[PDB]
Amino acid sequence: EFIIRIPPYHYIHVLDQNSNVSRVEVGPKTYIRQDNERVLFAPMRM
Amino acid sequence: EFIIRIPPYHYIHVLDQNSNVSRVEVGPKTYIRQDNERVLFAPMRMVTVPPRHYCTVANPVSRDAQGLVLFDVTGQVRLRHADLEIRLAQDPFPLYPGEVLEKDITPLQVVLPNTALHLKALLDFEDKDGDKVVAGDEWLFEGPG
Amino acid sequence: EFIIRIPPYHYIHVLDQNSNVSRVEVGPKTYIRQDNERVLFAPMRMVTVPPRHYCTVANPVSRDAQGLVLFDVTGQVRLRHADLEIRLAQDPFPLYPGEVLEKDITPLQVVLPNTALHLKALLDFEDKDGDKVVAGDEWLFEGPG
Amino acid sequence: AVPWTELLSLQTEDGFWLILNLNTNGLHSFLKQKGIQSLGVKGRECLLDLIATMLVLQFIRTRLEKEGIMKMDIPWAFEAIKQASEWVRRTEGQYPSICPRLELGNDWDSATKQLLGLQPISTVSPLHRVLHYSQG
Amino acid sequence: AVPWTELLSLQTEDGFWLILNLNTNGLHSFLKQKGIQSLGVKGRECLLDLIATMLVLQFIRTRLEKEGIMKMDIPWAFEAIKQASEWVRRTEGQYPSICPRLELGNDWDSATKQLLGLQPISTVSPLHRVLHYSQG
Amino acid sequence: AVPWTELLSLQTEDGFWLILNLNTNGLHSFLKQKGIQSLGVKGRECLLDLIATMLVLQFIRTRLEKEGIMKMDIPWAFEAIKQASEWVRRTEGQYPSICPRLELGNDWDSATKQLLGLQPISTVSPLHRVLHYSQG
């Protein structure tokens, strides 16, 4: 669950549950979330 | 689970799972943790020590010239490893994480008149008289005190 | 498996399978490995040594004039093979890979008064007095120290 | 109805002293912890003989007070009580205040009666591991 | 009810000393590890005889204190106790402080009572492999 | 309960020394490997008789210490022990430090007790093929 691999030209939304604030991460990057954070859905294409 | 009510003169330890760093919260306060954080145990009393008594705590707090608790760059507390510090009568201090209460509240011993104590120096130190007390030395502490 | 949480004053060893090279990570930090990498074992405590105590570790760390850990060109740590180094009271150092903790935390021995130690030189060395102590020599270490 | 002739069998050849019903090994451990080795081996044995003699005297005096009756001096043991009093009133003067400094009591009445186990002892005193260690 | 006549059989021809119930081989290993060969063979045997004699004296004194009763000097063994005291009070002066330097105790009471096994020993002392090695 | 009269049968005609329970052939191989032929045949036999006599003395002394009791000088063997002590205290002076140089121990206590097999020997010493070669 914790490991998030964003393919090139894809994005996700992850929820900061200490702030109730969501945000996007883009790019051909790998992502690691926190305990508080929660990725909303699977990596969809930009 | 999320609601934490610290009674007056009590403390807990809570673990920052984004840093693997634990910390104390004291006082008559109410506490709310995060999703990442996890309180380790139920609120236990800040240990108090009466007059004519003492205790020793393993791994004491590293402090400055004024007695402020020194911290790490990573939010951790600064200890002195495998040492023991003897604490006299004072306010109900808390126990910072990574510390064990080895000696309990034990009384200061009274030496009766016409009776003395045989004391050995375990480690080389300097006494308040002014002599470099080498380890292995022997002492004669007598008196009614 | 991928998430690695190193507690404060703990370490692990992880294997770079693209280089067959292992390495230590210390500190109160969190760790994420790669696909190639593999953590060897669960996070164990950096071994601490109190005062009036010592330990010996097989295959010690090769160091520079300042005590920095020397490394190999291939990312490996520089050892000194089949040697033993005796470490006195210090901070909780880690054990770099390829090292065995042979002697545990054992106390510095005290010599009672009117009693001495019979010491043999196993290997030719030079003592702090200034004599070339050839192997096979015998010693008389007496004292209350 | 304690064995009395067996008490007459345990009279020593100089005049001092399981029938006594007391934890002797815990008492030796207590007196060793209080530091009785700083008197010599002769002084240690001379003090243990005094403590044992006064303990037997307090036991017999509690027995006689339950019947109703340095002043101990029945026809069957008048000689042993007499030589015990003549021993004690000579050997006590070498050790003044040895009952507080070994932490047994104020005087010999307090010390031997609190070690005899017929009176309760307060909680602030360290005399708890001599009467309750034998109850295991 | 220890065998007493068999204790009278083990009186030596000079006046010193399985019935004692003590690990003797582990005790020899402990005293060898503490370095008793640096006294000569004569000095080693003279010290072992002193340690064994004082161990038997502490055993008999614990037996007599459980009954209630350098000052050891019953009619059936007064001569053996007398010659043992006359031996010990002469041979102890050659070895002052031999109980701390061999790491058995402060004085002979502490050393012989902690080797006798009737009192518990603290954990920082190396006296654990003499009373617990025989429990296998 | 070792055979004692059979030990009295093995007293030699000058006063020196399977009942001993020791690997004798492996001991001869060990002492030959340590180079005992460089002393003459007379010196070799004089050293083997000393080693065997001290081994029997350490065996009997371990037997007497388990019962509790150059100073060895029971009525049934006082003459043999006396002449053995008078032999040993004369013949030991010819061979100083023969126990380290043959690699058996520091002194005669260490050497005869580690060869007797009642104490464990450290692993860095070459004394392993004398107590474990007989266990096959």
DSSP state letters, F18-65: --S---HHHHHHHHHHTTGGGGHHHHHHHHHHHHHHHHHHHHHHHHHH
Query: Environment class of residue C109 by beta-carbon count within 10 Å: exposed (0-12), middle (13-18) or buried (19+)?
Result: exposed
User: If you count residue pairs, one on C and one on E, with CB atoms under 8 Å apart, how many are there?
Assistant: 5
Rg (CA), chain B: 20
CB contact under 8 A, E118 and D28: yes
Structure tokens at D118: 């017929």
Q: Which residues contact D11 (CB under 8 A, 6 or more apart)?
A: D17, D80
Q: Which residues of E touch C114 (CB under 8 A)?
A: 97, 101
Q: Which residues of B touch C9 (CB under 8 A)?
A: 98
Experimental technique of record: cryo-EM
Count CA within 13 A, CB hemisphere, residue A30. Answer: 7
Structure tokens at D89: 């009133």
Q: Where are the alpha helices (DSSP H) in D1-136?
A: 5-9, 24-33, 40-67, 78-91, 98-101, 108-116
D123 shares contact with chain B (CB less than 8 Å): no
Q: B: neighbours with 3+ CB pairs under 8 Å?
A: A, C, D
Q: Which residues of E touch C112 (CB under 8 A)?
A: 100-101
Distances (CA, A) of A38 to A22, A24, A31, B18, E129: 9, 12, 12, 14, 59
What are the residues facing B85 on neighbouring strands? B57
Resolution in A: 2.9
Which candidate from B98, B123, B137 shows the least CB-CB separation from C52? B123
Query: Environment class of residue F111 by beta-carbon count within 10 Å: exposed (0-12), middle (13-18) or buried (19+)?
Result: buried
Task: Mutation target for D interface from B53, B106, B108, B112: give the one with most D CBs within 10 A.
Answer: B112
Distance, C-alpha D77 to centroid of its chain: 18
Cα F91 to Cα F89: distance, rounded to the nearest angstrom = 6
Helix (H, G, I), strand (E, B) or coil at B12: strand
Q: F: neighbours with 3+ CB pairs under 8 Å?
A: E
Contact between residue C14 and residue C39 where contact means Cβ atoms under 8 Å apart: yes
C66 shares contact with chain E (CB less than 8 Å): no
Contact between residue D1 and residue E53 where contact means Cβ atoms under 8 Å apart: no
Strands B30-32 vs B3-5: parallel, antiparallel or unpaired: antiparallel
Residue E60 phi, psi dihedral angles, 5° rounding: -70, -30
Cα E81 to Cα E68: distance, rounded to the nearest angstrom = 18
Residue closest to A7 by CA, chosen among A30, A24, A25, A23:
A30
Tell me whether chains F and D touch (3+ CB pairs under 8 A). Answer: no
D63 shares contact with chain B (CB less than 8 Å): no
What are the residues facing A45 on neighbouring strands? A10
Q: Which residues of C touch E100 (CB under 8 A)?
A: 112
Contact between residue C117 and residue C139 where contact means Cβ atoms under 8 Å apart: yes
Residue F107 phi, psi dihedral angles, 5° rounding: -120, -170
Q: Which residues of B touch D101 (CB under 8 A)?
A: 112, 114-115
Structure tokens at E28: 């020899």
Listed in order, strand segments (DSSP E) in chain C are: 3-5, 10-16, 21-26, 30-32, 38-39, 44-45, 53-58, 84-87, 100-107, 116-120, 125-126, 132-133, 138-142
Cα F10 to Cα F53: distance, rounded to the nearest angstrom = 11
CB contact under 8 A, C27 and B135: no
Q: Tokens 């106390």 sit at which residue?
A: C107
Structure tokens at A42: 């699977």
Distances (CA, A) of D119 to D62, D109, D115, F51, F91: 11, 11, 9, 66, 69
Count of residues making up chain A:
46
Tell me whether chains D and A touch (3+ CB pairs under 8 A). Answer: no
Residue E57 phi, psi dihedral angles, 5° rounding: -65, -40
